[PDB]
Each structure stands twice: as C-alpha cells, then as structure tokens.
Amino acid sequence: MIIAIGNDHIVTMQKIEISNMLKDMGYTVIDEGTYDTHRTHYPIYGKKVAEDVADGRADLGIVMCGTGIGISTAADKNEGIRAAMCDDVTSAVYAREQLNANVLGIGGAVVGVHLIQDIVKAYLDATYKETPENKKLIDKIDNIAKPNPDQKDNPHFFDAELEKWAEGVYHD
C-alpha cells in the first residue's frame, strides 16, 4: 500500500517519526509535506497529498500541522477527498469505518508522538464497512463542493499568493 504524507514546518519532526514507522510497517511512503523547518504554508502540502490520493498515486494520505486544522482543511478542499481531522483514536476509527475517509489529519504540537502513532495505526488498521446510512452520508459529502478544473492537478494554483509573500504583502 502507498501512503502520501505532508506537513508544514511546525511538525516536520513528527512527520519524520510517522514516515519511519510507516516504512517499518511495510508501507511505501510518498513524502510531499515540507522537508525542513523553514517557514512555509500548510495548504501547499495538503493539496499535494490530496491529489496523490485523488489521482491514485497513493491509497491514503496523512497530513499534519501544529493543530492539523489548516492542512487537513486544505486537503479536504479537493476533488475525491474526504479528510478527517482526528486528534484521537476513537474518531479516527470512526472516520475510516463510517466515512471512508482517505486523508487523516493530526495536530503535531498538540498530540504526543506515542498517541500520534496509535491514531495512525488505528486509522490504517480500520476498514470501511458500507451501510445504507453511511453510503448516503458519504454521497452527500462528495457532492457539496463544485469542481474547479483550474485547481485540479495545477501545482501553480497558489503562485499568486507565493509572490505576494515574497514581496512582503503578508508582513506581521
């Protein structure tokens, strides 16, 4: 199985720990998230991971940022993705079994590494079991957003923002 993973600069160390664990477990990992700890933007990596999963390059995705909210939300805002923000094992298992979530988001910085490992393991070990009830929920979720071909598979989608950043538009 192939797992795509991504992160922003706040949790690169936690991402590394999970990448190591996934490989030891026998998974093939596609690391998309940022590789160092230089200030960057979570939507970039959430989108990259989302597309790996949506395009079939990866089976599932895992994204992390300080709280996980930013990157998991970015991942969710893509065609073919159902991203679940889960800082606990219980909701993560629910996410997979009931919503067939294909992207798991976790808050590095707020969840300790041992619990992060448990969440990931539980999520992966879980299996989606279709029911008339959750099939209906899933269908609803898959049809809320309006597809934008300009975003789909466009790695330059955020270039306008990146230039504004380089030009000091987003100063504190």
Place this chain on the structure above:
Amino acid sequence: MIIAIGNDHIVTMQKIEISNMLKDMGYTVIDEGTYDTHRTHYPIYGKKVAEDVADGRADLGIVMCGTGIGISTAADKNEGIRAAMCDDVTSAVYAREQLNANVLGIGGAVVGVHLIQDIVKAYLDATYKETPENKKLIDKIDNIAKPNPDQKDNPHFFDAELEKWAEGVYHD
C-alpha cells in the same frame, strides 16, 4: 515562586521545553527529574519533586513520564502532596481551584508540547478557591495514607531496588 520539576528518560526533551518556558515566565526552577535519556525509574524523580514541595523548598511541582501515570502516582504517594494527573487544561484548573493540588503530572509522550505548555500555564494561573465543600474533600484526601517516617526525606529509600536492578534481578 519556585517550581520543582522531574521526569523519567522518555520525556526529558519535553521537560526541557517546560523548564525553558517556566524560566522565561520568571519562575525559579529546581530540576530534579533525570537530566539525560538513559533508562531510569520514574518513582525516583517523583519522590524528589514531592519532597521539594512538601518540605517547602518549592511552591509547586510538575512531573512527567511517557503517560504521566507512573511519576504522578509516585508523587502522590508522599506526605503533604496532592498530585493531579492532567493531560488537559480543564481538569488541571479544577485540580488547582478545587483540590489545591500542589503537583501536576502530564504525559509527555501523549500530549503535544503546545498543549503541555497550555496545561502548565493554566494550572499555574489558577488559584485554590476554598469552600467548606472542597476543604472537606481535601482533608479526607490528606488523611488516607498512613505516614511512614522511613520514607520521609530518606534519599536511600530505593537503594534496595536499585541494587537489585544492578544485579540484573529486573531483566526482561
């Protein structure tokens, strides 16, 4: 104010982060917990932190281990101490305000550093609000254990167990 802190080898890095924060906040810190990451035993540091608080050398204590259970339980098993095992801000504030807990325990491997910082700050900011109700609870708590003079301020208290450890009695 003086804060005594301790930890086992699993969470030394998280302890360092909290020690740094406390000092930046103006607190005087007495670091008792283990200083490196060499395999050691949580009760040793839990007892050291407990006695600092009980004897008046420190105003409050903070102890951490993987889950926090071991070291916080050790801290609780000492005269004059009310140790609160809290991996969340809500119960930590309750512990200080209602039970006047003087030692805070946290799981450094299950709680992310940002949340650990929040729990510590919330606990320290909180103030014990005495009422006839909680005074009764606290008094009952302070009277459950039977004082053992052989333990109180006895640095060699665990020597027996440490010798056995060195003798390979506790092999896996």
Place this chain on the structure above:
Amino acid sequence: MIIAIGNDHIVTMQKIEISNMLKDMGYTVIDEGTYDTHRTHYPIYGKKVAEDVADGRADLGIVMCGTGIGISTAADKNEGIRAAMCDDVTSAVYAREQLNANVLGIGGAVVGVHLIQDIVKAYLDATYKETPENKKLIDKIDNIAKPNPDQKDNPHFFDAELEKWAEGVYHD
C-alpha cells in the same frame, strides 16, 4: 541560484539545518536526499544531487552522510561533476576557487552544525579563479572516467541492488 541537497538517514537533521539556512540566505533549494531517518543508501541521493547539477537543474550541490565520504564519492562518480569532500573551510574554498568543484560533501556526524554552516557559506561565497594551471587540472579530472550512458539520467540504475536488499541479500 539553485542548490540541490541530499543526504542519508544518519544526517537528516543536519541537512534540515542547512536547508533552512540556504533559504534564509535567499537560495532556492531542491531537496533530494532522504526526507526521514529510515535506513537507506547514500549513493541514491548522491546520484540525484549530481544529476541535478550536471543537467542544469541546480547550480551547485551539497551532500552529507555520517562522514560524507560515501555520498560525496557517489556524487563524484557522475558526468560533469567535481565533488569536493570538505570537513573544513580552508579546503572547501580551495575546492571552489581552484577546482571549480560543483558539489560539496560534508560529514554531518563528525562536523558540528556551526562549522557545517561556515563550510557551506565559505564554499558558496568563493568564486572559481581560472588560470592555465587549474584549467589543466580540471580538464584532466573531467576526463578520468569513461561515460556510461546506462547510468546517465537513469532513475532505475540501482533497482537491481534495491531488489536484492528487499530480498535480504545484504543482511548483517
């Protein structure tokens, strides 16, 4: 300017520190080396960095492993590359000024981060100063190896060895 960087699992943390510095300095970075700390093989990343430089995707390259010997030797064994293994500022400057080295190798486990930063900065700040003397040396160096089209830009070049590795052929 574009700097390609790579590393094996032993020095991923040192690579992250250098990647951060390069970006703060205004360089564009192409991180090829391994992204986590899972056991992998230095030649893979040395070759990737080498080809980035040789093909014009990067202006210069930096590679690191425990001692730097393995990955810098791998980088050197590629067309268009002159890799300089330098754990000191002096020889790194000589490498750039006299041998126009386009790939810098450093031992991330033997050189401290502050000195690594100094070596990198010195190497980047240096400029090749052509003379009939060094041009002769460089030309001789560029003509020692015999070009192998099967290696040049071949991503599957090491597949044979990786399969054996997965087959347990390289056990300890």
Place this chain on the structure above:
Amino acid sequence: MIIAIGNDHIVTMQKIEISNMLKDMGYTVIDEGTYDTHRTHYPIYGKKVAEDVADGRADLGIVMCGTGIGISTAADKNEGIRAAMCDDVTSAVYAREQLNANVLGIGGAVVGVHLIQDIVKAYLDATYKETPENKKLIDKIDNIAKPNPDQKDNPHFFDAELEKWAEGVYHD
C-alpha cells in the same frame, strides 16, 4: 569511576548524548552543567565541574559549550585542575598521557557527535605516564595561578554578576 560533566545552553543535547554513553560504559555521572536550553553562563558550570574533580567528588571532568573555549577556560581557572581544550582525538590523548589533564573540554556545535564520542573515549582510555619531562611541565602549570580562598568551594562566587544580569546591565 565518577565523571562530572557540565555545559551551557548551546550544547545541552550533545551533553545528554555523552552522559548516556558514559553510563552505558559503566561510569557514574555527576551532571552539573545546565539541564535545559535556557540562556545561561558557561563559567558557572565549568566551575562546578572543576570543583567536583578538585574536591575528589569526581575522578575526571568533561565540559562543553558552543566552542568549548569558554567553559574549558573557566574549568582551568580553579585549584587542582588541568583542563585541556580538545576538538580532536590526537591532542586529547596527548592531554591525558602527557599533561595528566583531569578536565576535558569540547566544542559542541563545532564537533559532530560521533567525533565527540571518539574524543571522550580516547581521552578516558588514555593513561597518564609520568616522565621527568612532563612531570616538570605539570609542576609549572600547577603553580602559575595564585589560590583565592574566596573562590574555592564558594558557589556564590558569581552572584554579583548574576544580579547585574537580572537587572539588565548586560543588555545587547
């Protein structure tokens, strides 16, 4: 054998690695240096380690700071100590065999962990071998400084400076 170790905030992580190694090797460690990474002053720990060795509480000492110069110099400025600043194995062995150095200083931040381990191991494994020539050098070194009883075993020796620091006298 007992080894006293100390450090400033810049190299606490490297100190931890050496402490772990020393314990695995069977040494008893007395950690004096700073325990976290909060800004502090190298002379404080160099003096503490120096006195442990001079007073017979420890057999040898190891001190580290960014470059090692600060803390090793502080250690050297104490009665009964011969502190050797060695970022390499060769001079460290010389320090022990010829000068019977009882305190080893190393620059974390400039020497990689693997080499630091080698320096420490080589230093400890070495043995002082008296010769008419080095006995004379050692005697000279032991008589250069003028003993100051106000400094000897006085942990409050730097209090005046610490207060000036707390009062902002040493602002940048």
Place this chain on the structure above:
Amino acid sequence: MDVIIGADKDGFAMKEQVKKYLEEHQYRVADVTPEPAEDFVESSLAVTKKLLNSDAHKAIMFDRYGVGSAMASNKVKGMVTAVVEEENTAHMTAEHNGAKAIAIGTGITGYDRALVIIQRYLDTEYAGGRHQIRLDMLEKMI
C-alpha cells in the same frame, strides 16, 4: 458578539446546554437547528450558510464525533471549520486559522471540557498578518 449554533440528533443535547450557557453570558445566539437536523451534513451546512451570510464570525457545530461536521462544511468554498477536542487548538485555530466555526463531538468531548474549549474559542480573535496567506489559499480552494 454573535454565535451561530447547529446540531444533528447526536449533538442536540449538548447544543441545548451550550445555548443556555451562551445566553447566560450575554451572547446573541442564532440556533439553526431548533429541532435536530437529519444528519451532520445538514446541520453543518445549515450553520455554514447562516454564518457566511451573517455578520457573525463565530459558530459551533455539534455531532457525535466532530469529524463529520468539519469534513462536510469544509467542502463549502470559503468555509473553515475546526474539529476541537482540546484546549490549545480551541484558541490557536481562531488565532491562526479563519476558524469560522468549531465542531465538537459529543461522544468524544465531555461537557465541562467542551465549555472551556468553547469559551477559549469565543475569546480569541484572528491575528491576521502572516497568517492571511494561508487563509487566502484556503478560500481559493473548492
């Protein structure tokens, strides 16, 4: 300050308690689910519509796990919903993210903790500045 709330059958009980809490603390509450919504997609989307069309910038969605309300509502262009189960994210998501709403799972988070989470969320304002680039990126997505 305005606060929009909504819930499905599983989150209804807590929603009602919080509404009482909010009113007692002078908050002007807009309840979009006086009766439990059919499911969390309906409740979360109802909260989203009311929010993006109102002058309020704070909202709370209630369901069994939180995950669902966030997953569904985040599909709406311009919406940013944070599942919250601890006290750090409670304020950080507001400070850094647009956190137009938070989602609480009644089967995950106890009431006393939910109240601390909610109050921290309501007491925190968006910091803007450097964080705006990420929000601009999110609002650009589907």
Place this chain on the structure above:
Amino acid sequence: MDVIIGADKDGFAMKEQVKKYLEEHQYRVADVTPEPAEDFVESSLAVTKKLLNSDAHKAIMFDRYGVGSAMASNKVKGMVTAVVEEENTAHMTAEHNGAKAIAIGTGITGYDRALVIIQRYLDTEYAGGRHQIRLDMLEKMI
C-alpha cells in the same frame, strides 16, 4: 474476566451505561456503588478496597474529572490508579504500570471515547519484566 466499578454522583450515569455494556460483552462486574457514593473519595476507596481484596485486577472509577478519584485512591498503599483521557494511555498504563484501576472523568471524556479507552485497558495485560522495579518502588510508598 472480572471488573470492579464505582462512581460518585457525577460519574454515576456513565457508570450505569458502562455496566450494561460490560454485561452485554461477557464481563462479570462488581458494582460497589449501586447508588452514587457521597463523593469521589468514598467511591474510589470503595473500588480500591474491593479490588485489593478480590481476585480481579481490572477496575474502573467514574467521577466528574478523573483526577480526584486517582488522587484519592493512589494514597492507598499498594494501589495504582490511572486517570485516562486518551487511547494510548488506556493500554500503556496497563502494560507498564500495575494499572489496578483507571479513572474516567465524565465531564472530560465522551461516552464513545470512554468505551474505546475501557476496552483497550481491559484487553491489555501487564508486561512485567523491567517494569516491576517501578511497581515495587510504588508499592513501597505510602
């Protein structure tokens, strides 16, 4: 397998829910508080007494915040009680510590999460080995 349970007025509701759950899943339960205890000190000590006297090694204490029951019962020589709010400690405290009982705060942990926590705790055995040195140290304290 056997399980000892107890609760004060705040944790009584969940205690009743869990009892029914445990019974349905083939578990012999010993409820030491058929009626809510005066407070968590009384309930935690009741559970501890019954535990340190029975042949069971698993117990669950219910109260509002968890902290109180653990703080109280840990004062008893030989007792080891773990407050549990997440799924990792749920099993690790059993594996590494004597984990004679876990304490759940109903104001902190939702019911669905509580069941996962409980199940993990009940399904995990003490590893012994090196961990025993720490348990011997704890049992030696007051």
Place this chain on the structure above:
Amino acid sequence: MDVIIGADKDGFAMKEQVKKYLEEHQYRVADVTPEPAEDFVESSLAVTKKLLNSDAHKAIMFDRYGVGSAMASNKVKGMVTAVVEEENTAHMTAEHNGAKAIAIGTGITGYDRALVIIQRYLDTEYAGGRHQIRLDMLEKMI
C-alpha cells in the same frame, strides 16, 4: 600488511616521513612516487592503479588539501578514496566504505594528527554485511 603510498610536490615531505614511520612499524610499503608526481591527479591515479592491481587493500595519498586526490581517484571505476582530516572518519570510512585509500592534505592536517589518522585507518577492517549494498552501488558508477 601492505600499504601503497604516493604524493605530488606538496605532499611529498609528509609522504617521506610516513614511509619511514611505516617501515619502522613493520609495514611493507609500495611507494609509487619515489620522486614527487607532476600533480595530485598523477599521484592519485598512480596509487589507484597500483592498488587495484596489487593484493593490498590500504593506501595513502598525500597532497596539499586532500580534496584533489580524492576528487581525481574517485573518478576511477571501482575506486573509493576518503579525504581524512579527523580521527572518527579515519576508522569509520574503512569500516563502512571500501576505503581503498585515504587522502591527507599536508596544508590541512598536522603530522602528529596524520599519524593517528593513518594508524586508525590501517587498524580497521571493512565490516561488510549491510554496507555492501552501498559499495556495489558505487562500484557500478563511472
């Protein structure tokens, strides 16, 4: 044991000192540059040729900065040359890498340190095992 040595004009002096050292310490030395080589390319290639043709597996190249000799000889298919300036690499490159030769820069490394480096290199054998995959990869390159 056998040792192949060579040097250009800058490393000749130390090469001569080391040769005498090695001879005194029972070492059969093969000096391929009795007279200084034209440059480090000539000296390093001379050492490499003699090595990849003899039954010896240890070699020392001397030049001004070390980097040049390694840069040159590593271009030879199958060769692995390590620039060495400190005592850890001195043995690790032999243990992990094929370390068929080490290069010492006389303008960088002092004589006493050079002897310790050399001795460590000569006293260390290749560990084989997992490291072989990397050597097979290197020998496969140009």
Place this chain on the structure above:
Amino acid sequence: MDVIIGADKDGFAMKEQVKKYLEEHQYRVADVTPEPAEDFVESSLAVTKKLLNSDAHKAIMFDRYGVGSAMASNKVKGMVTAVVEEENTAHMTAEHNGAKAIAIGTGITGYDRALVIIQRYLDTEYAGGRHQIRLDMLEKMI
C-alpha cells in the same frame, strides 16, 4: 593592529612563517620568542605578560598541540586563551570570548589552515553586550 606571537621548539617553524605573513600584511608584530622558548609554559606565559601589559588585543601562541599553551596561559588571572583548530572557533572565540590569544598546535593544524584560522581571528572584534557577563566571571577567577 598589533599582534603578539610566541612559540616553543615545536611551534617555532610555523611561528616564523606566520610572522612573515603578518609583516607582509602590514601587521605590527611583537615576537617574544626570537629563539624558541624552553617549553610551551615559558612561551605562552611570555605572550601573556607582553599582551596584558601592551595595547594589543590579539596574540598567537605556537606549540605542538595548542592544548598546553592554553592550559598554562589560562591559569593567569585575566587571561583568556583559545586553542583553535578549525575555522568557526577562529572567529567565534573572538566575538564571544575575550580571546586575548589563540593557540595553534603545529602537529595538529596544517599551515594553510592555520593561516585561515589566524586571519579570521584577527579580522573579528569582540561583540561585548550580553557576552560581557561571562568575561567578567572569567576575569574574576584565578
């Protein structure tokens, strides 16, 4: 800029080369050991005395390993000597420490590297500020 230099028998050769280098670069050099000193204690102390009594704030001591000259000279009250064998400490010891002198081991450090170390040391000024507290502490010691 003034520079004080000194050396024993082992460091004399390099001292002479550096003196030539320094003069060629317009530095006013004060050589306290025109003839090699008896040992490094004598040379290092000679440099220290000349330094602490002169208006110069830069000095270089030469011996076989550097360690000795630093160990001996640092015993003098107010003196701060840095053994330097790499290019980062070369400037950092001046910037942060009083680095009234640096010690170079001729058996450890090659000439070309020594020159880079020396030039970096000479080109760097003490930063003062927060660093003064540590220097005040050192100057207070014996």
